[PDB]
């Protein structure tokens, strides 16, 4: 049993660009041989938070889809990407379920994403009228109403545009530096052979 249809994890962790957290990407991975060891033994990541599966089991486990969600956040917000958490990201930019089966992997991208003068290309949602469900994505740009009036869709007294940019700069201190986050969500529906660890004899 030799293996060559390996999973494209080498792209998604290593991408030219990541999505804004308010509009996070969802990469579906299926029909492939995984080898998670190149992630867990990497010194490039600062964070490996596993809630379901673990670094010592994954190399030998099968799943029907693995989903690599990906986005850019401010470093202080890394702690919100977890089951059981709250806060502006956990509540409405990117929510993980309390029974999340996977692992959250993250790293500092200050030398990739920060720019002198401010990299404002990464947006986060400042406001919603409700919290998000796990793996829900909300990309509406309508004006957020805080007052008694919708004010006809303009910024104004108790009227706010819900998406604000992170002012990322190479000189910001740690916690104000950008971080790249990839979340591996795992599921087993119908045919587990669709994603598996390595094959032998």
């Amino acid at each position: 049993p030799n293996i060559t249809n390996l999973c494209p994890f080498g792209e998604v962790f290593n991408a030219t660009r990541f999505a804004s957290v308010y509009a996070w990407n969802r990469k579906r991975i299926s029909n492939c041989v995984a080898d998670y060891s190149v992630l867990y033994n990497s010194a490039s990541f600062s964070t490996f938070k596993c809630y379901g599966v673990s670094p010592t089991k994954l190399n030998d486990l099968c799943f029907t889809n693995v989903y690599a969600d990906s986005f850019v956040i401010r470093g202080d917000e890394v702690r919100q990407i977890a089951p059981g958490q709250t806060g502006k990201i956990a509540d409405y930019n990117y929510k993980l379920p309390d029974d999340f089966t996977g692992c959250v992997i993250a790293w500092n991208s200050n030398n990739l994403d920060s720019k002198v003068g401010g990299n404002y290309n990464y947006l986060y949602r400042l406001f919603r009228k409700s919290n998000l469900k796990p793996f829900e994505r909300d990309i509406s740009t309508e004006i957020y109403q805080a007052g008694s009036t919708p004010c006809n869709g303009v910024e104004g007294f108790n009227c706010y545009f819900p998406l604000q940019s992170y002012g990322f700069q190479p000189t910001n201190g740690v916690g104000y530096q950008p971080y790249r986050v990839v979340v591996l969500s795992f599921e087993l529906l119908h045919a587990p052979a669709t994603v598996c660890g390595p094959k032998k004899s």
Partner: protein, 595 residues
Amino acid sequence: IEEQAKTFLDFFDSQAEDLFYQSSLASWNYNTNITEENVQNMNNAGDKWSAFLKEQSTLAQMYPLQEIQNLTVKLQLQALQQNGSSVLSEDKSKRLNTILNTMSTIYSTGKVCNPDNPQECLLLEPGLNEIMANSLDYNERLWAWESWRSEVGKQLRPLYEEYVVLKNEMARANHYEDYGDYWRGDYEVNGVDGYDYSRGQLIEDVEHTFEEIKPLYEHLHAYVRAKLMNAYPSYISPIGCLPAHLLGDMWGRFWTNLYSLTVPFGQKPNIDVTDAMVDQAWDAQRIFKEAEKFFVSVGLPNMTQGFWENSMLTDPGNVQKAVCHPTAWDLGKGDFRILMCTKVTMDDFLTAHHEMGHIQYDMAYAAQPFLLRNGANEGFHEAVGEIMSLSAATPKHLKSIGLLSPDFQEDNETEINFLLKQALTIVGTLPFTYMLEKWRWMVFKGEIPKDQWMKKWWEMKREIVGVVEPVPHDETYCDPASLFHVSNDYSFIRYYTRTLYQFQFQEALCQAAKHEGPLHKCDISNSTEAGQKLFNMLRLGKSEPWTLALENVVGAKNMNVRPLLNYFEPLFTWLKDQNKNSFVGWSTDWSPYAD
């Protein structure tokens, strides 16, 4: 209505946390490279930040404070709902700005000449201060002193005559009785049960405390007078006020330059370890690393990577115009830096501890909402920086870290010389700060008529400080105008309150560290109980009443002089034993020009 107000403040941070950072960096860049490009950039960024505050403030004012139950939101709203600038009409605003820029200019460009020797034309802060510091020539010192009053003081006076009206009108527009009352609002606590402090309370606490300080001052004053009379044998009366021009500075603010005349035991060496640093091949980096070790040893965080990579620790290595008066920076977004030009000497060693103490305070409250990221009140940033320096300077510390020889022996006479130098620095300045603010408050309040400003200025200096003018100047003069803090619109009482806080902190932390000796021998290095005790306050920023925040560390809701007196009691004891052949206290009738 906090449904709207907290939402507004979340939007506020979403803009403010960036615009302040752009303004902040432009200011930094200017100071590290002084050039027209940076001047225009800091001015432009400055205006953007100011305009943003004005717009934002206008919106904050929609949300009445009386609707707000949540104190954190109420405090944040109070901070940006302040009216201040633009409460007055545009012409009044422009006129006041014109006056203030004019005052600053007259002070900073106020080049004074010697009519008998034109080569002596100088500004105060380069070279003319050397005459006031170090000359022992009574008449040379007088020429310098009088020349600043006649060439700078008189010229600023008419700006004060109009200024106090414009500032009081502003203060009234902001619902304060006068501008002195406006400034005193910094210490106000209002709406927190058990921690309240009215603005007028500061006056009572300052006056009450000062009366308790006086005995220490009177004995120090008598000692200094006894010594200055040998230096100036035909000029100083044994029972009178000291001449102002003989106190070591242009206004007599500190008595540190009198040390060379007053040293108790002149046969003894100092604990100046500049040579140790030089002989041991220290550099600026070593000095800051030793200061870092000091703070981490008590449980404080280390400096950030940014600090070590982009701070300015030394002067430029080329002919580069830059300003590096030592200062700590919090540039926003967790960017902390120090700016100074460190030389390998004991004064810069202590300065590094002072400035890093300010940075540690700034790091501690970095977690507060943007508008609460400040010290508990205006005197706390320095109270914290001063205790870090005060502890670093004690011989126990210096010997332990290799600056004093292993064979160094501290003795009876060394202690006295040490305490006197500090008393001249501290005790000798408390009456200056006290007197100046009392006078300015009385001026803003309208208690002192504009035709009686100098009459009371000098009467008060003789009654409170015990200093007398060499020249019976009339009302065309304005002595306090000639001082930087007055010409540049700063509150001054912060130094009084800071000094008292400094000693309350040192004593509380020294006890936390379980020290077994005299207060002046305290070293809380490598002691985490004291470090955590202070940290727990530093982290609060403006989120708590300063009275509460202070209680948490020192066991008091107010200022307390006892720690100061306890710090200097061994000196006082010596000063009481001294002066058995002299008079303690002074008259206010006698003057150096009397005849």
